[PDB]
Design an enzyme around this catalytic site. Structure first.
Site, PDB file in Angstrom:
ATOM      1  N   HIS A 161     -79.988  88.717 -26.683  1.00  0.00           N
ATOM      2  CA  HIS A 161     -80.340  89.415 -25.448  1.00  0.00           C
ATOM      3  C   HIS A 161     -81.837  89.328 -25.124  1.00  0.00           C
ATOM      4  O   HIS A 161     -82.325  90.037 -24.266  1.00  0.00           O
ATOM      5  CB  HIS A 161     -79.908  90.906 -25.518  1.00  0.00           C
ATOM      6  CG  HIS A 161     -80.645  91.803 -26.528  1.00  0.00           C
ATOM      7  ND1 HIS A 161     -80.179  92.286 -27.681  1.00  0.00           N
ATOM      8  CD2 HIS A 161     -81.915  92.312 -26.353  1.00  0.00           C
ATOM      9  CE1 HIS A 161     -81.125  93.064 -28.197  1.00  0.00           C
ATOM     10  NE2 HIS A 161     -82.151  93.069 -27.390  1.00  0.00           N
ATOM     11  N   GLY A 218     -89.080  97.268 -27.665  1.00  0.00           N
ATOM     12  CA  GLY A 218     -90.174  96.371 -27.926  1.00  0.00           C
ATOM     13  C   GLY A 218     -90.002  95.696 -29.274  1.00  0.00           C
ATOM     14  O   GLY A 218     -90.692  94.719 -29.575  1.00  0.00           O
ATOM     15  N   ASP A 265     -75.299  88.911 -31.441  1.00  0.00           N
ATOM     16  CA  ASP A 265     -76.595  88.948 -30.798  1.00  0.00           C
ATOM     17  C   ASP A 265     -77.617  88.203 -31.674  1.00  0.00           C
ATOM     18  O   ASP A 265     -78.383  88.829 -32.421  1.00  0.00           O
ATOM     19  CB  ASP A 265     -76.942  90.412 -30.631  1.00  0.00           C
ATOM     20  CG  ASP A 265     -78.140  90.745 -29.776  1.00  0.00           C
ATOM     21  OD1 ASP A 265     -78.740  89.873 -29.152  1.00  0.00           O
ATOM     22  OD2 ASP A 265     -78.453  91.914 -29.707  1.00  0.00           O
ATOM     23  N   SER A 319     -86.953  94.568 -30.345  1.00  0.00           N
ATOM     24  CA  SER A 319     -85.728  93.723 -30.363  1.00  0.00           C
ATOM     25  C   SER A 319     -86.030  92.316 -30.769  1.00  0.00           C
ATOM     26  O   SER A 319     -86.930  91.662 -30.247  1.00  0.00           O
ATOM     27  CB  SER A 319     -85.007  93.592 -28.995  1.00  0.00           C
ATOM     28  OG  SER A 319     -84.946  94.734 -28.144  1.00  0.00           O
ATOM     29  N   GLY A 320     -85.314  91.875 -31.768  1.00  0.00           N
ATOM     30  CA  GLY A 320     -85.421  90.511 -32.213  1.00  0.00           C
ATOM     31  C   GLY A 320     -86.128  90.416 -33.498  1.00  0.00           C
ATOM     32  O   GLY A 320     -86.058  89.391 -34.179  1.00  0.00           O
ATOM     33  N   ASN A 349    -103.207  92.281 -34.425  1.00  0.00           N
ATOM     34  CA  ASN A 349    -103.493  93.073 -33.241  1.00  0.00           C
ATOM     35  C   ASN A 349    -103.041  92.182 -32.116  1.00  0.00           C
ATOM     36  O   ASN A 349    -103.633  91.089 -31.969  1.00  0.00           O
ATOM     37  CB  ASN A 349    -105.006  93.344 -33.171  1.00  0.00           C
ATOM     38  CG  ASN A 349    -105.494  94.052 -31.911  1.00  0.00           C
ATOM     39  OD1 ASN A 349    -105.077  93.724 -30.812  1.00  0.00           O
ATOM     40  ND2 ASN A 349    -106.447  94.962 -31.988  1.00  0.00           N
TER      41      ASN A 349
HETATM   42 CA   LIG Z   1    -104.283  88.856 -31.905  1.00  0.00          CA
END
Ligand SMILES: [Ca+2]
Ligand SMILES: [Ca+2]
Lengths: 55, 223, 223
Positions: free
Chosen positions: C40, C175, C84, C177-178, C54
């Site tokens: 998805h 955020g 999925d 997912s996966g 970061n």
């Molecule tokens: Ca970076």
């Protein structure tokens, strides 16, 4: 309106409403499946990228 | 049934009506003691009404027998409606006569094209609702799994067949669930679900009974 | 990740971020040329950002490589989220160093109880949203398929595992997912869906990677 909603964990989320409702899904719903019982058990298969209403 | 005909006497003898106050679903008589319906039609307490035609008046030729066993298919899924099939064992065998009779389970599956007869006392209006006293019948063909899937994507599993017309106007509808889709004298489908009734591009999805014949055999013989 | 810790440098080297403008999902590096994520998260156009810590500032140690092939599992269902899983083949192999490294596919499946580390740059608030610059990590155990099913009924198939806490408070969130759920040094899960984040009784459901190892093998070898 929706009580159970299942969203994926993506930005944006892909959301579904899992509620089986009585005879109806809602008026905002373009993909409503109902069983052909009397009354019908209806579920709205809509997907919205965020999760509220369908109403 | 939206857009079908009044069935005519003793035309559909395996048709069963499930009642718990009133008609809430239908089903088929498959032998003198076991009725097959749809798993989403489950209630504890079902009264089977056999030899019905006008369900609103008593015509003295009906048999009302309580269900003793109601068994939903073990893998039935209430959310995706997969394996939507249920077996009701009657607390007494129906006495089989002209008005009351058995359908046969499939020697094989129907092939896209075969015409069938669907039947039920469910709604007759795609837009609105009329509920008929008399049993309605509808001739409709089995669609290709390919048409079926393109019409309802991500939803049609391999235990579901679409029967009906892509151009809408004729279909099963609420109140018809559990009823028979008989093709060539064999029960090939059970009315299950759909997007509205008789809509364009939305044909009825029916449980594919050829997939469950041994389950049916196994449950009847083990109970 | 709701309620997890900042991961610390070079702690999670297989973590990948999928970008198409911005981070929308994450993934894992499984060999120098193939990333595994969730179906998805499919976009045409994904840029893989490797060696990210970061994600908001460039720290000169990152590798950005375009996806050349994005292949979703053939049986992926967008409505129930079954199968999925998605394979991204990079248009150039990532140069493997300390900051960039491969996870191993499962020798077997995780057993209910095994502690794992989940990781991602997704939301940190069950109620509200904060999106962290730094990679967040969370230790959580695999729950029993029995707990998982009782927590989400009719929805958990045999390709989905629940990882997290029935109490709530700690979980993946949008955020993530996966992203990877690595247990014992092996990738056992992919973050997928859930009701809300860190809710009571509603732990995360993840794709069960042990079920797809041969699919992964043949797609990598056949492409
Ligand atoms: Ca970076
Ligand atoms: Ca009558």
């Amino acid at each position: 309106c929706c009580d159970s909603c299942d969203c994926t964990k993506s930005k944006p989320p892909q959301c579904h409403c899992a509620n089986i409702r009585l005879n109806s899904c809602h008026s905002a719903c373009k993909s409503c499946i109902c069983t052909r019982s009397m009354p019908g058990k209806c579920r709205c298969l809509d997907t919205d990228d965020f999760c509220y209403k369908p109403c | 049934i939206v857009g079908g005909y009044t069935c005519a006497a003793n035309s559909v003898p395996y048709q069963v009506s499930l009642n718990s106050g009133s008609h809430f679903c239908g089903g088929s008589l498959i032998n003198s003691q076991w009725v097959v319906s749809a798993a989403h039609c489950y209630k504890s307490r079902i009264q089977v009404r056999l030899g019905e035609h006008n369900i609103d008046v008593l015509e003295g030729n009906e048999q009302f027998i309580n269900a003793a066993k109601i068994i939903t298919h073990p893998n039935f899924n209430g959310n995706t409606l997969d394996n939507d099939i249920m077996l009701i064992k009657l607390s007494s065998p129906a006495t089989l006569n002209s008005r009351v009779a058995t359908v046969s389970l499939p020697r094989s599956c129907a092939a896209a094209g075969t015409e069938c007869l669907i039947s039920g006392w469910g709604n007759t209006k795609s837009s609105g609702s009329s509920y008929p006293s008399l049993l309605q019948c509808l001739k409709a063909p089995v669609l290709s799994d390919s048409s079926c899937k393109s019409a309802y994507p991500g939803q049609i599993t391999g235990n579901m067949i679409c029967v009906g017309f892509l151009e809408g106007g004729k279909d099963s509808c609420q109140g018809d669930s559990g009823g028979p889709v008989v093709c060539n004298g064999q029960l090939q489908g059970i009315v299950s679900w759909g997007y509205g009734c008789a809509q364009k591009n939305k044909p009825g999805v029916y449980t594919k009974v050829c997939n469950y014949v041994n389950w049916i055999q196994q449950t009847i013989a083990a109970n």
